[PDB]
Amino acid sequence: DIVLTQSPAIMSAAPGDKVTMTCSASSSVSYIHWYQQKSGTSPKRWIYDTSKLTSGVPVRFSGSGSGTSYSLTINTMEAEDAATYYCQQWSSHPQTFGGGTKLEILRADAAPTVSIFPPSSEQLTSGGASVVCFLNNFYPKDINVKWKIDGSERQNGVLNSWTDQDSKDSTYSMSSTLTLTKDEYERHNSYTCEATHKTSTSPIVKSFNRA
Amino acid sequence: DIVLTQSPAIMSAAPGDKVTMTCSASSSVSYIHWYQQKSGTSPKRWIYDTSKLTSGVPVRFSGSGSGTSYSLTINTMEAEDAATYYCQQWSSHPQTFGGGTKLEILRADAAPTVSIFPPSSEQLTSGGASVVCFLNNFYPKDINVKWKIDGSERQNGVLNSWTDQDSKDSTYSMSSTLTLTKDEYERHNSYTCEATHKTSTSPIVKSFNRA
Amino acid sequence: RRQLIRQLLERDKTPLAILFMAAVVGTLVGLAAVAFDKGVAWLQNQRMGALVHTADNYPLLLTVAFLCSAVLAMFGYFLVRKYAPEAGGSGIPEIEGALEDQRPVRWWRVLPVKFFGGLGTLGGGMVLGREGPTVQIGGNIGRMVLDIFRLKGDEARHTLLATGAAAGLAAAFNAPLAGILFIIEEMRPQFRYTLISIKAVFIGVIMSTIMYRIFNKLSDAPLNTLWLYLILGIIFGIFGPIFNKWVLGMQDLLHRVHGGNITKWVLMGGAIGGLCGLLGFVAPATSGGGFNLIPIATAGNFSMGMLVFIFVARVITTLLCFSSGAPGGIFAPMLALGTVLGTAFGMVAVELFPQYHLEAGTFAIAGMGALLAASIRAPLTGIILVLEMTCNYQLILPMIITGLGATLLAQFTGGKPLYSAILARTLAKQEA
Amino acid sequence: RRRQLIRQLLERDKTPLAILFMAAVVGTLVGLAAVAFDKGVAWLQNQRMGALVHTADNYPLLLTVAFLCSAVLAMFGYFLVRKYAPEAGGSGIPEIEGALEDQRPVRWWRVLPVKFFGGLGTLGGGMVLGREGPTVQIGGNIGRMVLDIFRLKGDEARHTLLATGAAAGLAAAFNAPLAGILFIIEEMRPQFRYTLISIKAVFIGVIMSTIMYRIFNHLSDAPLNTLWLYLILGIIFGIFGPIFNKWVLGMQDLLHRVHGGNITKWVLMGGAIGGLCGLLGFVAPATSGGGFNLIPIATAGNFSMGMLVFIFVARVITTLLCFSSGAPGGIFAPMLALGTVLGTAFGMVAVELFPQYHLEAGTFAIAGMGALLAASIRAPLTGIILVLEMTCNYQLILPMIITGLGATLLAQFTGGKPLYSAILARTLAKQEA
Amino acid sequence: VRLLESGGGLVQPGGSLKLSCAASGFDYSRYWMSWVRQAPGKGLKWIGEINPVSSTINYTPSLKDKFIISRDNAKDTLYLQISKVRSEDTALYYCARLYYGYGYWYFDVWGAGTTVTVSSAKTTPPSVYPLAPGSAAAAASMVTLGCLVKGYFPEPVTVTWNSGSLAAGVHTFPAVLQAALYTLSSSVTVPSSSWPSETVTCNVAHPASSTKVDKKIVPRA
Amino acid sequence: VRLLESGGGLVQPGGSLKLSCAASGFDYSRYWMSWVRQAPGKGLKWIGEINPVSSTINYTPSLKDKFIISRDNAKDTLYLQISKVRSEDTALYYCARLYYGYGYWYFDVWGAGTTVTVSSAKTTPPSVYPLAPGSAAAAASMVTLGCLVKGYFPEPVTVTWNSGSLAAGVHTFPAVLQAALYTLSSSVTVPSSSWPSETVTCNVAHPASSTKVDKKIVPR
Ligand SMILES: [Cl-]
Ligand SMILES: [Cl-]
Ligand SMILES: [Cl-]
Ligand SMILES: [Cl-]
């Protein structure tokens, strides 16, 4: 069955750029469609019969190509186009989707906003003690978080989670959680969270004291 | 708004006989409808637009009329044709029904099977005492029950309930229940129940003696 | 020019006399049709009911089905061969002749011969349609009133004849529009102007349809799918001329079996009529008017092989009943053949093109009127009839495209209007 | 002779391949033209809506630029008509009817750019006019152009290709192939003599031009005891059909007085009418426009009886003014609007009067849609099949006829003439006399 | 086609309730639906009707918002709210589908109904007493037993004998109101060999008061 | 037009499940319906389709009874039965309604999805803990609260704040697997004059276990 392969797998562009992504087919195809998939959202029909925009889709979007090669183009891209775009043919049976092209936005710098939270007493009445740290709204995505207990660095039992890019403001956010046993937690005092990011030379430290 | 008057409210004929009722309108109507209602079930559409039969109705049934006079007719009645037939017009608005005609089977006269039942020892442990008399399976429907306590007439506290006609043997039944206070019941001995029916000049007397 | 201006000004001014009289032709034609319709239904009902009584003995019920449809048939062929030979077969070309003033309308003879003769053939289960009867009877009814009231002029002779034949078609298919369109497309004189009033034809059709009413959704079709409908017409267009040959050819051959002789004709009419009652029990799909199997074929119920059978069989039986000169139409029979060939075509396209998401039933609808497209060459009338009967509008373009394919290729493979050939057959033999 | 009939009957329905093929090209060009026209009308209509956004707060200025944009497009339209092709004013349908009678020339080199860029102005101006006019006239001319371009000879060639063009045009204007065919073999074609118009070619041309349109532009029931109500509707449609014809023709005369032929008096007259529409297109947007907008809204009954009386009067006023003044544009589509609105209004009355029928005004709206065609144009069959093409409600097919015949009977008996024939006769008479 | 109405039962005068008719069998659109009520032992009376789009809703000459008909083409159901409910609203309430022939409209297919009762009287379960023949009663070929269902409100109760397997020779009489309570009796007739050698039990249900009772008929000593 | 699918969650390898998809806001029949699935962070694979009357039911290349699509037009519901289940079948199952332009078909409106998790683990609801700021927060213009959703299985859970009324300013982060149990948290920045003055409440849903927790965030 027809294999559609989507040339840039991950592209990146400052808003204002003209952006183009490709969908090359193994055999010949005709009148392909493109879908739009933002983080957390289901695919939305975007462009159909090769160059028709679904009603709602702004004019900056267009499509073309023929036979074995098709593009979809964004003529002046905007930040709210940050998404993964799938192509798809059904000129042959069975239909078949591409593997996508995930568009990412280039924007100006943005410093993280760091928040620290001590274990909740509901969790302390279990035997756990999760110390969570939120790093919200930073660009670019490259951030280091670094966990200090009383003064010394900690690496055992830390888990990180990164949101995708935002649709509107193009930022990233992160949560670092330091998970311990109640007893492991209760035998220290000062926990801290140190965020090192492009927007500052001195790391952002947020801490709290059990006492 | 049109008042439909159906001529015989109640009537009877023996299976094989030519039956014919009537629907007479206050003002003028055109294309009326007939419904067959058996006890306990939904009115079924039977005849419509004056004379067309409903898919299912046997061809013995037929209709005809005009102006302010119409008529359902059953050339050879059957056992299953006993029912209540309501005429209804909607030539004028609002639509209206007749009071109905109840068509009943005519059979050979049958005398009632009388049974008298004294109060149960369960009821008496409560302060009430009712004496049930059943007059079972009799035609015609006219019957006269009469209670006697110690051979002496008593008419207050009796309640009678007739049945509609039996589906299997086209008969009737009736239940007379003389309710008293327990104290009132225990101070007499002989309770009797006298059914007077067309079929026999001398009444069928049923009774019991407490002692 | 000055004459044209004088004509433009005086356009659409049909004598009030003709418009009133059209409204009596229609009434009469509608009742005539309804009575006929009721009669045929009553006889099909008797033949069935006499197989209920004789339920046992497998080879007995085969024979009583045979003899009833043969006895009713013989009665049909005889009435035609004795009292109105001109009123055998379709009847449409005979009225087409009448409008050209090249054939007579012996209504005093034809009305009773067709009405009862048809009653015989149609009620026997023969592969014949009520159009033939109701159309011929239609014009005759319409000529009777002209004569009985003594209306003068060419306008009245043509109009009251047309409006009758039209009211005739509309009472057979509950299809007024089909009845009007058939006059202007197929019936009315093809090569000269006539004084047929369309308005009169409307009136007759309406009144006729009312009489019939008094006593009585497939998927869409995407652009990339339209070529499949062109091919269907192409298949119909090469096949219609061939089926036309066989209608004419089998008229010539079936003649040789009796030589003209009323007795051998009426007997042979019992053999053919008898076959249709015999096939009408043992395989009902190969027999009858054809309106039995059309809704069952549009749902795609019949297997492939069952359709191929039903097709080849109904080609065989349609020919025999019609070409033997039995009173009855070939109009309905052709709707049922096409409806079949369509469903077969669609089933092959379904499996060949899953990416079109096809429903065979649309190809049924497209090919329903598409043998009337190639044989009788009146697409516009057929297309509309089908649309009237299915009102599946969304298929109106596929329906036109198939129609055109059938009409083009019928033309370029030498085919001719099957009704106008039949008239030319008559007239050409009438000067010899 | 009976001998010629046989020869004719046997040689029936054999159209030459060279005419059939040319019907295919005609249809492809007419549908293309038709689409381009349509797209341009939409674009302009829109630009005008975009002007009422840049001047949205200032209400007097808003109402001024509503009047001026339309008045400027109308004026540009009348100018193209008067200066280059006076034959290409009004509908266009009668001017093709003549060309089939061989009484009016087909000046395609003139009418094509005029009618196209003219109507583009008047229709884009938001006037009460149809696309039928421009597309039917252009259609015929597009057929006439490919006749002359391939200098094809014969009466069959000339009438067939001049008819397939005119039919393909209407099919595109309504996405309605069948109506196109019936329009040719009912109203358009020479009404009193034989003609060699090949219907197969008309079939081809219609098909092609409907495909071209498709490539770029992709009710309850009626029982017997309710039938007489459709007759009445029709009767009322028939009494008013001639009255409407007399007004449109009357108003034709009464506007020629205002400018007496003068090109600059005419253009300016058009300017004030076209401006009046642009204005009503804002303040009262149902009283203006080609009238399609309000057919689905009226078929429901979202409009009230009060509003219906208001639209019908206003639309009559504004249909006359735009068409009677000889702007390039039809009267066909506005007669469907008038037909619906009245039919709706009848259905509403009918609903409240006879509850025992359980009516739906929407059936009377659908019966009445192709009724004013039946009464003014006297082409009932086309209006029935057009409206049955668009809305198909089959259960209504008998009511739809009864209404049509009712109006066609009462158009005759009340002294009405077919409206396109009346205009052609006017034009042949004005020419000779 | 099947119309199955719910919603009925007991209400107090002044109160208001909403009956429901649940349609299956057919395309619920395309059809006019309508309510018709039948008061005890009396005529069929039309209440109202409703077109498919619910753009036309007519009632018999009533007081403004006595009756509100409405429908739900999604759920496939017809509703009827009644207000100011007084005793004249005690009736069996049929829902029904409307169609026609020539266009003089009829009530095509009816539901079984729902009974509504308007009484300030209060729900009350039945006492079920048996009826056994007397101390000097004769044993013929047929012997008639019965049970008295006394004291309940509202209607209905259900009586069956040996759980329904004794269907013939049964006679459940109509109930009688008296002092805001109903009373009814049932009569079985079995062969003499059948009773008292084998058990004969009467099964009374009065779901209004969640009463399920069996009263075994034993002879008197 | 809403397509809301359901009936997914945890299936043992070798067993089966009935996914259903409830249509609303359109004539369900008239449309061909289809299912498409998307495995973790991966591509879209067609599973099958079914015409309105259920007389044509096409699948992708697969074994005879692997998949069984069906539909019930009187409920406006599509179905998908999956047998002999293996981790290849762990994915998000979208239900979409079909249509065409010129005629080359496409997936018109898509549902929200149901996640199917092929695993011999045990279904397990979340514990939901509130993350409130420490008593060392210089009350700026804004304040960030969070809540912590710990130890649920399988995915997904869904977090909103004050029932969705607090949309802007919310970050719900991806889950992380640890000892066959999923764990995540959500932050929400609000004005300091809006809290603790007014209540902030995180609403966790874990549909696999049919659980909802409405944990309120309290100052410490
Ligand atoms: Cl013939
Ligand atoms: Cl025929
Ligand atoms: Cl004009
Ligand atoms: Cl026009």
PDB file of N, CA, C and O in Angstrom, chain C residues 209-243:
ATOM      1  N   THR C 209     -54.027  11.439 -13.354  1.00  0.00           N
ATOM      2  CA  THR C 209     -53.287  11.115 -12.133  1.00  0.00           C
ATOM      3  C   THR C 209     -54.179  11.163 -10.891  1.00  0.00           C
ATOM      4  O   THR C 209     -54.087  10.273 -10.048  1.00  0.00           O
ATOM      5  N   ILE C 210     -55.039  12.179 -10.775  1.00  0.00           N
ATOM      6  CA  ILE C 210     -55.939  12.255  -9.620  1.00  0.00           C
ATOM      7  C   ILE C 210     -56.770  10.981  -9.543  1.00  0.00           C
ATOM      8  O   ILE C 210     -56.822  10.362  -8.486  1.00  0.00           O
ATOM      9  N   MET C 211     -57.388  10.567 -10.650  1.00  0.00           N
ATOM     10  CA  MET C 211     -58.165   9.322 -10.650  1.00  0.00           C
ATOM     11  C   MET C 211     -57.334   8.165 -10.090  1.00  0.00           C
ATOM     12  O   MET C 211     -57.819   7.400  -9.270  1.00  0.00           O
ATOM     13  N   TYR C 212     -56.084   8.046 -10.522  1.00  0.00           N
ATOM     14  CA  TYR C 212     -55.214   7.001 -10.003  1.00  0.00           C
ATOM     15  C   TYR C 212     -54.937   7.191  -8.501  1.00  0.00           C
ATOM     16  O   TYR C 212     -54.910   6.214  -7.756  1.00  0.00           O
ATOM     17  N   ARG C 213     -54.743   8.431  -8.054  1.00  0.00           N
ATOM     18  CA  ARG C 213     -54.542   8.706  -6.620  1.00  0.00           C
ATOM     19  C   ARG C 213     -55.822   8.467  -5.778  1.00  0.00           C
ATOM     20  O   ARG C 213     -55.738   8.061  -4.622  1.00  0.00           O
ATOM     21  N   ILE C 214     -56.997   8.727  -6.355  1.00  0.00           N
ATOM     22  CA  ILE C 214     -58.273   8.561  -5.639  1.00  0.00           C
ATOM     23  C   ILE C 214     -58.493   7.108  -5.247  1.00  0.00           C
ATOM     24  O   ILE C 214     -58.997   6.839  -4.164  1.00  0.00           O
ATOM     25  N   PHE C 215     -58.127   6.185  -6.140  1.00  0.00           N
ATOM     26  CA  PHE C 215     -58.328   4.747  -5.934  1.00  0.00           C
ATOM     27  C   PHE C 215     -57.039   4.040  -5.525  1.00  0.00           C
ATOM     28  O   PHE C 215     -56.999   2.816  -5.513  1.00  0.00           O
ATOM     29  N   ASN C 216     -55.990   4.805  -5.214  1.00  0.00           N
ATOM     30  CA  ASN C 216     -54.707   4.251  -4.745  1.00  0.00           C
ATOM     31  C   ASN C 216     -54.005   5.229  -3.798  1.00  0.00           C
ATOM     32  O   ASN C 216     -53.417   4.833  -2.793  1.00  0.00           O
ATOM     33  N   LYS C 217     -33.458   6.204  -0.263  1.00  0.00           N
ATOM     34  CA  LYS C 217     -32.584   7.310  -0.643  1.00  0.00           C
ATOM     35  C   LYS C 217     -31.126   6.863  -0.750  1.00  0.00           C
ATOM     36  O   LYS C 217     -30.430   6.715   0.259  1.00  0.00           O
ATOM     37  N   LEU C 218     -30.674   6.659  -1.986  1.00  0.00           N
ATOM     38  CA  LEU C 218     -29.304   6.229  -2.252  1.00  0.00           C
ATOM     39  C   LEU C 218     -28.332   7.343  -1.909  1.00  0.00           C
ATOM     40  O   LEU C 218     -28.728   8.497  -1.692  1.00  0.00           O
ATOM     41  N   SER C 219     -27.053   6.983  -1.870  1.00  0.00           N
ATOM     42  CA  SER C 219     -25.989   7.931  -1.555  1.00  0.00           C
ATOM     43  C   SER C 219     -25.718   8.855  -2.740  1.00  0.00           C
ATOM     44  O   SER C 219     -26.139   8.571  -3.857  1.00  0.00           O
ATOM     45  N   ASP C 220     -25.013   9.953  -2.492  1.00  0.00           N
ATOM     46  CA  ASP C 220     -24.582  10.850  -3.567  1.00  0.00           C
ATOM     47  C   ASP C 220     -23.536  10.195  -4.508  1.00  0.00           C
ATOM     48  O   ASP C 220     -23.200   9.018  -4.366  1.00  0.00           O
ATOM     49  N   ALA C 221     -23.051  10.964  -5.484  1.00  0.00           N
ATOM     50  CA  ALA C 221     -22.194  10.457  -6.559  1.00  0.00           C
ATOM     51  C   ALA C 221     -21.085  11.451  -6.903  1.00  0.00           C
ATOM     52  O   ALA C 221     -21.277  12.272  -7.796  1.00  0.00           O
ATOM     53  N   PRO C 222     -19.922  11.361  -6.222  1.00  0.00           N
ATOM     54  CA  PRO C 222     -18.779  12.292  -6.344  1.00  0.00           C
ATOM     55  C   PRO C 222     -18.270  12.485  -7.776  1.00  0.00           C
ATOM     56  O   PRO C 222     -18.504  11.619  -8.621  1.00  0.00           O
ATOM     57  N   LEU C 223     -17.567  13.584  -8.044  1.00  0.00           N
ATOM     58  CA  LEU C 223     -17.139  13.882  -9.416  1.00  0.00           C
ATOM     59  C   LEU C 223     -16.281  12.790 -10.015  1.00  0.00           C
ATOM     60  O   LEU C 223     -16.491  12.399 -11.166  1.00  0.00           O
ATOM     61  N   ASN C 224     -15.318  12.289  -9.239  1.00  0.00           N
ATOM     62  CA  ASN C 224     -14.373  11.287  -9.742  1.00  0.00           C
ATOM     63  C   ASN C 224     -15.011   9.925 -10.058  1.00  0.00           C
ATOM     64  O   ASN C 224     -14.329   9.003 -10.479  1.00  0.00           O
ATOM     65  N   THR C 225     -16.320   9.833  -9.848  1.00  0.00           N
ATOM     66  CA  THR C 225     -17.110   8.634 -10.058  1.00  0.00           C
ATOM     67  C   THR C 225     -17.969   8.745 -11.332  1.00  0.00           C
ATOM     68  O   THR C 225     -18.535   7.743 -11.776  1.00  0.00           O
ATOM     69  N   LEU C 226     -18.047   9.937 -11.939  1.00  0.00           N
ATOM     70  CA  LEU C 226     -18.946  10.156 -13.087  1.00  0.00           C
ATOM     71  C   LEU C 226     -18.601   9.308 -14.315  1.00  0.00           C
ATOM     72  O   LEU C 226     -19.498   8.935 -15.067  1.00  0.00           O
ATOM     73  N   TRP C 227     -17.317   9.016 -14.528  1.00  0.00           N
ATOM     74  CA  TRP C 227     -16.899   8.189 -15.678  1.00  0.00           C
ATOM     75  C   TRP C 227     -17.486   6.777 -15.640  1.00  0.00           C
ATOM     76  O   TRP C 227     -17.764   6.182 -16.684  1.00  0.00           O
ATOM     77  N   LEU C 228     -17.677   6.244 -14.441  1.00  0.00           N
ATOM     78  CA  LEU C 228     -18.303   4.944 -14.298  1.00  0.00           C
ATOM     79  C   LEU C 228     -19.710   4.964 -14.883  1.00  0.00           C
ATOM     80  O   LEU C 228     -20.151   3.960 -15.447  1.00  0.00           O
ATOM     81  N   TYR C 229     -20.393   6.107 -14.771  1.00  0.00           N
ATOM     82  CA  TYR C 229     -21.723   6.293 -15.378  1.00  0.00           C
ATOM     83  C   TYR C 229     -21.682   6.461 -16.891  1.00  0.00           C
ATOM     84  O   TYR C 229     -22.639   6.089 -17.569  1.00  0.00           O
ATOM     85  N   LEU C 230     -20.585   7.009 -17.420  1.00  0.00           N
ATOM     86  CA  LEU C 230     -20.389   7.083 -18.881  1.00  0.00           C
ATOM     87  C   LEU C 230     -20.208   5.703 -19.483  1.00  0.00           C
ATOM     88  O   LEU C 230     -20.742   5.418 -20.556  1.00  0.00           O
ATOM     89  N   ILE C 231     -19.439   4.861 -18.797  1.00  0.00           N
ATOM     90  CA  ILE C 231     -19.219   3.489 -19.242  1.00  0.00           C
ATOM     91  C   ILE C 231     -20.528   2.687 -19.244  1.00  0.00           C
ATOM     92  O   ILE C 231     -20.810   1.916 -20.180  1.00  0.00           O
ATOM     93  N   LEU C 232     -21.337   2.886 -18.207  1.00  0.00           N
ATOM     94  CA  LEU C 232     -22.596   2.166 -18.108  1.00  0.00           C
ATOM     95  C   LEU C 232     -23.449   2.470 -19.346  1.00  0.00           C
ATOM     96  O   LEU C 232     -23.953   1.552 -19.990  1.00  0.00           O
ATOM     97  N   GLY C 233     -23.574   3.754 -19.690  1.00  0.00           N
ATOM     98  CA  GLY C 233     -24.277   4.174 -20.905  1.00  0.00           C
ATOM     99  C   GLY C 233     -23.692   3.558 -22.164  1.00  0.00           C
ATOM    100  O   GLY C 233     -24.420   3.014 -22.978  1.00  0.00           O
ATOM    101  N   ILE C 234     -22.370   3.649 -22.311  1.00  0.00           N
ATOM    102  CA  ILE C 234     -21.622   2.933 -23.363  1.00  0.00           C
ATOM    103  C   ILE C 234     -22.005   1.447 -23.469  1.00  0.00           C
ATOM    104  O   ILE C 234     -22.236   0.953 -24.567  1.00  0.00           O
ATOM    105  N   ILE C 235     -22.073   0.738 -22.347  1.00  0.00           N
ATOM    106  CA  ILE C 235     -22.527  -0.652 -22.381  1.00  0.00           C
ATOM    107  C   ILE C 235     -23.994  -0.754 -22.840  1.00  0.00           C
ATOM    108  O   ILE C 235     -24.348  -1.638 -23.620  1.00  0.00           O
ATOM    109  N   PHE C 236     -24.835   0.158 -22.358  1.00  0.00           N
ATOM    110  CA  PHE C 236     -26.255   0.207 -22.735  1.00  0.00           C
ATOM    111  C   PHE C 236     -26.438   0.610 -24.195  1.00  0.00           C
ATOM    112  O   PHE C 236     -27.336   0.129 -24.877  1.00  0.00           O
ATOM    113  N   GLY C 237     -25.583   1.511 -24.656  1.00  0.00           N
ATOM    114  CA  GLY C 237     -25.676   2.058 -25.990  1.00  0.00           C
ATOM    115  C   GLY C 237     -25.333   1.067 -27.071  1.00  0.00           C
ATOM    116  O   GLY C 237     -25.872   1.152 -28.160  1.00  0.00           O
ATOM    117  N   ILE C 238     -24.430   0.132 -26.793  1.00  0.00           N
ATOM    118  CA  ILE C 238     -24.113  -0.906 -27.776  1.00  0.00           C
ATOM    119  C   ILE C 238     -25.119  -2.042 -27.658  1.00  0.00           C
ATOM    120  O   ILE C 238     -25.349  -2.748 -28.629  1.00  0.00           O
ATOM    121  N   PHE C 239     -25.726  -2.208 -26.484  1.00  0.00           N
ATOM    122  CA  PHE C 239     -26.652  -3.321 -26.251  1.00  0.00           C
ATOM    123  C   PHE C 239     -28.089  -3.067 -26.685  1.00  0.00           C
ATOM    124  O   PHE C 239     -28.813  -4.019 -26.985  1.00  0.00           O
ATOM    125  N   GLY C 240     -28.511  -1.802 -26.686  1.00  0.00           N
ATOM    126  CA  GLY C 240     -29.880  -1.420 -27.080  1.00  0.00           C
ATOM    127  C   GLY C 240     -30.234  -1.719 -28.530  1.00  0.00           C
ATOM    128  O   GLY C 240     -31.303  -2.267 -28.805  1.00  0.00           O
ATOM    129  N   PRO C 241     -29.345  -1.349 -29.474  1.00  0.00           N
ATOM    130  CA  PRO C 241     -29.521  -1.666 -30.892  1.00  0.00           C
ATOM    131  C   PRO C 241     -29.647  -3.168 -31.137  1.00  0.00           C
ATOM    132  O   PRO C 241     -30.445  -3.605 -31.989  1.00  0.00           O
ATOM    133  N   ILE C 242     -28.845  -3.933 -30.396  1.00  0.00           N
ATOM    134  CA  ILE C 242     -28.845  -5.381 -30.486  1.00  0.00           C
ATOM    135  C   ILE C 242     -30.174  -5.926 -29.965  1.00  0.00           C
ATOM    136  O   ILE C 242     -30.801  -6.755 -30.624  1.00  0.00           O
ATOM    137  N   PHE C 243     -30.617  -5.452 -28.804  1.00  0.00           N
ATOM    138  CA  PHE C 243     -31.926  -5.858 -28.281  1.00  0.00           C
ATOM    139  C   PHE C 243     -33.071  -5.378 -29.199  1.00  0.00           C
ATOM    140  O   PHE C 243     -34.108  -6.038 -29.296  1.00  0.00           O
TER     141      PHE C 243
END
